[PDB]
Design a protein around this ligand. Structure first.
Ligand SMILES: *Cc1c(COP(=O)(O)O)cnc(C)c1O
Ligand SMILES: *Cc1c(COP(=O)(O)O)cnc(C)c1O
Lengths: 355, 355
């Protein structure tokens, strides 16, 4: 996975402090100031076990989405929520969509599930199409989708998601939607608002990217099925959410200006960054909707990750993602100054080269 | 599990802040001052993912035990290490000893293991005897022991552990030793020093009780089998140890006076506390070796946990531990002032009553 600055620094024989990381997609605003204050002023809570039931955290999450607290189960990162859903639903047959986030295949493999892959097509610009509907069959127990997709950044239109959601309902298939980056996309509500009466739908959320607290580990799962969620609480390990994460979560949801400030940055700097990248030669830039962009280098003989590492800039290589190949890379969208150094580095590598 | 002050407070209709908790066994010294300083001064590390490989943390743990770093895998609390060992060894048949720590049975059940229970006997003062040796058979894949035992506090003599360890070696049985509280016991090294050449032995450790950081969640597993430990690293969820826990761990191991100060407190206040309890009527006190004591109320009609809750003091009831019954309770050993309030409360409940 990206963000492994320590391993990148190790390969170069330097300290991770000298790397400009564009392989992790963390909100460049940093952790909310209020979250930092709360952590410093409540550090002493570390001396006691967290609330095994996470009452305050879950109340805050439920207030935030205006749903019953019984529908929510926080996790030690959304990563834990992915393993919890896999172990709790224990599918016999499940479908994933590739290119996509690798942890689903890992969690499903560990739970002993037959995995079917629906392949996105380069000829479709990696866009999810309605062709997937016919591929859904009664023997499938679960379908997992990433909305928006990692690494492409594409967000399937609500009508298509709704049609898949309805076909899953009729074929008794659980639909798991990974909304890790949904809060970066202006005015996108995701599916939490539609879970009442759609107990086959599961939504995964993360505070990692959006609130810039990847090191604390906090995510959550939301679903309206009483029995299934009761099962999820038993399947999850006790005390798995640390006390500081739970405190951070509660405080972060209280920042009323945070989202607007992110949308504004993404609309301004994010758009300028995307435009600048599209101006580079030998580079296809896919229209990502959140804080990262999938790139395809048109010269297969150019190792963009290696070239940028010489400049101490780390990008994500998508060479090993099923469905992609070595021409594919992913870069975060960060601050203007940081984005400028990445552009300068790419620009020097890509300009002056024949097709 | 104990330490659920929120749930206890909920049952009474009060705030957990008004309860004196003797149901969690946390070092009363609190978190090391150096750990608190380090956390405050490095809070910003939360903005990046932890090192997926935990190089610094594992180097510190390896330096501490003077063993190869390859033998260690930190966990999100020793609780995670218990689930990791269960899922990584995937035993078909395993033996546990009861009364004991409940998470082993839960982790084994989830991994689909046939569980055999070796029962400790009240007639033996709950002491582990050599009779267990004959109960070990070739069809067993694993044997799990708690050293010292939770909730009894008893530490099996090294010779008996060595004999069990050798019988497991000959019968190809993995021996897992839970040393969560071993550092509280003066001059007890545990088994880490003997793992070289004993790859069938696994040791679980926790920084939770000893360094008073239960809210941060940090424990670890140690074993000298190359392949098996490689498997454990794959079985464990990515980024499961949060960044602050990893930092705390490294700093805590640097406190050279911490252990002596704990042994001193335990030898002084701990002994005075144990003696005072033995003076109470209608109360059997087992000779615990760490920071907790198992109590047996001689009047079955006296609900000690309920009576103490009226005084806003929470103790652990061992009524639901397989092998024990409602006469059994467990109390932490804390500060002198705190211990005095517990004694006063017990003394008022127990004095003035006929046999
Ligand atoms: C980053 C990411 C995750 C995991 O997030 P954490 O909360 O840090 O574990 C899950 N899914 C997708 C699609 C992600 O990008
Ligand atoms: C407390 C305890 C654990 C778990 O400790 P954490 O590090 O907080 O998960 C495991 N085993 C025993 C015997 C314990 O007492």
């Amino acid at each position: 996975h990206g963000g492994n600055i320590r391993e990148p620094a190790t390969v170069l024989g330097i300290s991770p402090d000298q790397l400009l990381d564009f392989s992790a997609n963390i909100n460049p605003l940093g952790m909310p100031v209020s979250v930092k204050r709360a952590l410093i002023d409540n550090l002493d809570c570390i001396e006691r076990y967290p609330d095994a039931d996470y009452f305050h955290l879950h109340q805050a999450l439920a207030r935030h989405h205006q749903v019953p607290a019984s529908w929510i189960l926080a996790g030690n990162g959304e990563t834990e929520s992915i393993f919890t859903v896999a172990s709790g639903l224990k599918p016999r047959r499940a479908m994933i969509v590739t290119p996509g986030f690798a942890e689903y295949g890992r969690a499903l493999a560990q739970s002993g599930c037959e995995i079917r892959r629906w392949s996105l097509r380069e000829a479709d610009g990696w866009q999810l199409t309605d062709a997937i509907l016919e591929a859904l069959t009664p023997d499938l127990d679960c379908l997992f989708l990433c909305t928006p997709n990692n690494p492409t950044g594409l967000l399937p239109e609500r009508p298509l998601l709704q049609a898949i959601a309805d076909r899953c309902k009729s074929l008794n298939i659980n639909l798991i939607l990974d909304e890790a980056f949904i809060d970066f996309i202006p005015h996108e509500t995701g599916f939490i608002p539609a879970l009442k009466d759609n107990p086959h739908i599961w939504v995964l959320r993360s505070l990692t990217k959006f609130y810039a607290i990847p090191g604390l580990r906090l995510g959550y799962l939301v679903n309206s099925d009483d029995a299934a969620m009761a099962r999820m609480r038993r399947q999850q390990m006790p005390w798995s959410v640390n006390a500081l994460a739970a405190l951070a979560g509660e405080v972060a949801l209280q920042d009323s200006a945070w989202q607007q400030a992110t949308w504004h940055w993404l609309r301004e700097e994010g758009a300028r960054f995307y435009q600048a990248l599209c101006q580079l030669p030998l580079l296809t830039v896919y229209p990502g909707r959140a804080n990262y962009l999938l790139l395809r280098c048109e010269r297969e003989d150019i190792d963009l990750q290696r070239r940028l590492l010489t400049q101490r800039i780390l990008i994500r290589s998508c060479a090993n993602y099923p469905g992609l190949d070595s021409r594919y890379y992913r870069v975060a969208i960060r601050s203007a100054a940081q984005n400028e150094r990445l552009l300068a580095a790419l620009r020097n590598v890509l300009t002056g080269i024949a097709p």
